[PDB]
Design a protein around this ligand. Structure first.
Ligand SMILES: CNc1nc2c(ncn2[C@@H]2O[C@H](COS(=O)(=O)NC(=O)CCc3c[nH]c4ccccc34)[C@@H](O)[C@H]2O)c2nccn12
Lengths: 112, 116
């Protein structure tokens, strides 16, 4: 909640929401790196994947299932890339765990 | 006779093809990538054959989560203390080369944006 993603979860700032349930939220990224670029985040404040608990595994998996269902609904039928960044080397921009989903163009290698 | 399937990754699961294995349990296998794109670059794969994330079942949630937890634990065990990037590729636009779900973990250098 002490992050901008917490404000988004609490509906305190605008975000174009794609999907919500009781435990996660998917919304378009404000700084998109592909024609389609959205985030899937848990409502629980996990600061970074490195500190996720064992009992968070189903929740983390849920982010990926939601992400792939959202990608399908957004029409990403030629594919996409999912990304989780950790720490400074990973380029983690917000210390609230987030899954990026990017598509609508060819993604290149290496992935940064 | 051949659980895990006959992609290269299925053959690695059954020890038919060599790999450099970091971690193994009943659900997954972590091993170093043969064409690393960072100083440390490994894969985490399920032992259950799922071809790609787009066809994963709802009841694959815990398994997918387990790949990420195993990924982060392996990253810590390998000493990636400045961080890392996890990547799942889907289909042609994602650059998916092998149709058996896999999580990339890359670290030991600054990763750039965009992620490809
Ligand atoms: C461990 N052992 C091992 N690993 C292998 C083998 N063949 C492939 N892999 C590994 O599987 C990963 C699949 O990633 S992925 O499917 O997500 N796709 C890619 O990685 C391709 C990305 C790409 C997109 N455009 C490009 C343009 C040029 C080069 C690559 C690309 C890659 O990182 C490969 O290095 C193999 N044969 C025997 C043992 N082997």
């Amino acid at each position: 909640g002490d992050t901008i993603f917490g404000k988004i979860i609490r509906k305190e700032i605008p975000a174009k929401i794609i999907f919500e349930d009781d435990r996660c939220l998917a919304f378009h990224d404000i700084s998109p790196q592909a024609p389609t670029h959205f985030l899937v985040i848990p409502k629980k404040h996990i600061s970074q994947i490195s500190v996720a608990e064992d009992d968070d595994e189903s929740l983390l998996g849920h982010l990926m299932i939601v992400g792939k269902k959202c990608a399908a609904d957004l029409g990403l039928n030629k594919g996409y890339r999912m990304v989780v960044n950790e720490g400074s080397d990973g380029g983690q921009s917000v210390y609230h765990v987030h899954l990026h989903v990017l598509g609508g163009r060819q993604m290149h290698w290496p992935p940064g």
